[PDB]
Task: structure prediction
Amino acid sequence: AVQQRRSSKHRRDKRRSHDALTAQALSVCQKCGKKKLFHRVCSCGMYGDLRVKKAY
Amino acid sequence: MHAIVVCGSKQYLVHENDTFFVEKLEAPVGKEIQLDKVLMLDEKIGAPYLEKARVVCVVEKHGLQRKVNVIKHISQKHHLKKYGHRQPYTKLKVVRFVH
Amino acid sequence: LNQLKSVPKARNHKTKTLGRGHGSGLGKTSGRGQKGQKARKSGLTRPGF
Amino acid sequence: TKGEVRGGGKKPYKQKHTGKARQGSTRNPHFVGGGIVFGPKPNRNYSLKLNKKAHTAALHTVWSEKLASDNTHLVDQNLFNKTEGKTKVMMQFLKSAKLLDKNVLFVVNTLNTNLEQSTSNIKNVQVKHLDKVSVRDLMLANALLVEKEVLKALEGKF
Amino acid sequence: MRIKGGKQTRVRRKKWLKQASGSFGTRHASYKVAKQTVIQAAKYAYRDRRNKKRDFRSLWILRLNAALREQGMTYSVFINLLKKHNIEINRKVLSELAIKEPSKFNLIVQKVKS
Amino acid sequence: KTSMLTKEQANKRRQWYIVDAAGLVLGKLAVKAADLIRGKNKVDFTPNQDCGDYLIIINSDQVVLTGNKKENEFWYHHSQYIGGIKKVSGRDMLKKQSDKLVYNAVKGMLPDNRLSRRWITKVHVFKGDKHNMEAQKPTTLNWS
Amino acid sequence: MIAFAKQFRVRISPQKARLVCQLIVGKKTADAQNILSNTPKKAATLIAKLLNSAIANATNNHGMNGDALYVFECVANQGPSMKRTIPRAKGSSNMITKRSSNLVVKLSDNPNERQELIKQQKALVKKRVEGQQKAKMAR
RNA sequence: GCGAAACAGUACCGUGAGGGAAAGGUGAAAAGAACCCAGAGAUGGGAGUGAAAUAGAUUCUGAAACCAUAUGCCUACAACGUGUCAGAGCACAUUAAUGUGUGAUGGCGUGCGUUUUGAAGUAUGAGCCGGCGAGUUAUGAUAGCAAGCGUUAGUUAACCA
RNA sequence: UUCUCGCAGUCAGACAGUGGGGGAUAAGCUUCAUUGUCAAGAGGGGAAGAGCCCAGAUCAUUAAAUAAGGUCCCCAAAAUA
RNA sequence: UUGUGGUAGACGAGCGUUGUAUUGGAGUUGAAGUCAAAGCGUGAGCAUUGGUGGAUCCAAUACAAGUGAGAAUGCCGGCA
Result:
């Protein structure tokens, strides 16, 4: 169904301002640069186990 | 000191060089006028409008109050009728109220 | 007179236009009222009616 | 007007089942493409009627109060004889006239061809005929000369 | 002949709608809601000019009666004493503010007796 | 013109007060408490500044029920349910919670504002005798 | 400051870009570039690349320092869109709309430039009132 | 203003009769942004032209409506067309003006037009603004008013000047 | 308030009360005469209270006392016996 | 003194839109459009200055209305 009026800016912001983003995990690399997410492979290959991957 | 005087249609308690606003009374600015509509003459009260405690005052300035733009209308009708009324005001102060 | 001093000689009478004004009247009212035959395009009626 | 607009008009939608404005044609006198009911026609009379008695009275009073104007001195054949068709002599006169600010009318009835040839090179030179004039322009020139031989002639028409 | 009405109407409605401002959200960036706000403010000012005298007089009477009952008398008896005798010229707001003045109101206390 | 009445603002000064007069009917005590916590006894009164007083009450459950109201006095408090109304007995609220009865009375005799509920918060009435503000030297009074 | 890049007609929904720009505003170069790269969106990497290009412009072209620059402004305001018909059921139809935005980015070196505009406005009002008062002496 | 300045009955909408809009302003002048910056380039930025790129080509003014932002205020026990009249608190000192703006909190306070005896209305229709939109032209009479006129006053028609 | 001019708006009102009619003598029901109100014109109060009391409201005042009504508190104001 | 409750309804007088008929004055040392502000009036209005801005306007007297815009589920641009 629908009402007989419109929804102003304030109602939307009360809906939108609580849709705001949040923070994330982080992982400083202990052997290289290219700071990466936690529990994620750094973007320069050399990972803890080994260079499980590449830089690109 | 202190004295309640009557001027225009309002009362005011006046002290040394007391500045306040009163209703306009078709009087010039700067004149030293002695009012006889005064009471509370130094903690003394008079039924016949106690006098001989003269209060000489000087008008600080005159002016026009904010515009009273009355829109006389009826609800559920437009009936817009605007007219700007102005009630003149008067700023004044006592000089030394020589008694 | 002239094109900068043409003072009037007092011949100009009030003109009534029924479709103008809200604080000057002649609004929706238009000097006729709004009901019945008077609220339609029923002007210019035969005087024999 | 509404019915004199080129272009087909009809109801573009249905009467019911449409909560918008209902129109029997595309154009109405609330449109910005045509259809306004009330407008001008090339027949507005704007006709004022002036009586012959009133016309003569106006002529007489305007002439009489122009007699008292700044430019009231009389003219004759003399300046026509002296002047040529050249605007040179006309602007020499203007220099000697000292009345450049006035739009002086060279009102003549003899029609000296030098005046018609000349008298358009400055913002004050203008020559017209005598018998074909109007009171509006007669009092509007703010100054203009009169002829000496037409006194009884102007008296005749009053 | 086509009469110009583009800018002139803009200026007219700009003058008309200027009085509407300082409202919650957006009640001043339109015409009808702006008229609503302006007319409500005008009627509020009209009713103030009509009745703030009685409002302030009632407030002064209430406060003055509270002070009287602090001193040990009611407004009815006090005004009766002021009326039937003790011809004194003083207003309610000034009477209630005279308490702040040291002993000036107490002077009224011993003088207002019939 | 206008006297330009200005309110006395930005001042924190209220004394401490106590009363032990349980035994009299609800109405007079409730109206006196409402006047005391409202600011009806100030020569220099200010409605939008500290005006209400601080009254603590000791042994407020000694009130007796007068007249024929013994098995007649009850109050309505309806929770938004099916038959959620609560009907508590007057003859039992005397021994049971009675300070909240005075709270309800004074809150019913006050003008409904945020200041009204703040005045309600500014009242410390309890059935017992051991409290905390008695150490603040509460000036004993009665019916203010 | 410098490193500004106006981008009108960026065809994208403004419902999402302005919010993320507001979240991003108030961060340095690398600590924002890495998080933009660590996004599943389709705009953050391009915003980081544009920021790098703008920093290059500021440092090389204007000869700026590029030692304290941070994100001073990011917003996705109204953008002209393409609105055409779209079929529906029961023989009805609607108007589909593919929107755009007006991308604009500004950077600031100092935490200031919120009050420099205030000082400019103060100078403007002072010179305005000076004209007004020299007019008043003409009364 | 011709629907039709703008490549108009054009694109387009119907088989067919038929219907059908919008689209001018650079700079006096391209002297149209050479060289460089990041990039894949668009692009944006310098550099330069230039009176100026709020003169840089969606280049004649460039608003309202709208989209957002933070600077000074205060605000997350909160029952309010949310404002009035009072007034704390905060920042400035003027179109010198009962200083200017914001506003802790209190007495008070159901939007608009409609026909409606009566709608805040559970009747009505409207989000917004921009432009635009409704008592009309001629002819004839009546009446009021203003002007002339005179003791058959005046006006012309057609036609001519 | 008698006479001439004409622009009007108006025969779809309601209500408060009295005498009525139909009606249970109900009607937020209808129709008469009849005193007024809103309509054509508002305030306070009556818990909000259209026909209820003061009732007649150029404007401005933070001035005086009253009318109906109210005076334990809030919504004002009062007690004495 | 009557005074100003007052709907429709009747009565009177002004301001304003541009344009015209003009005497006058103002424009690259800026004319206008544009928007802000702690003025002026009794009302239709005058604005004062500033700036974006870039070549035409403004005061006064007479006349013309397609002459004063909130409602027509009014047309419609833009935009929620």
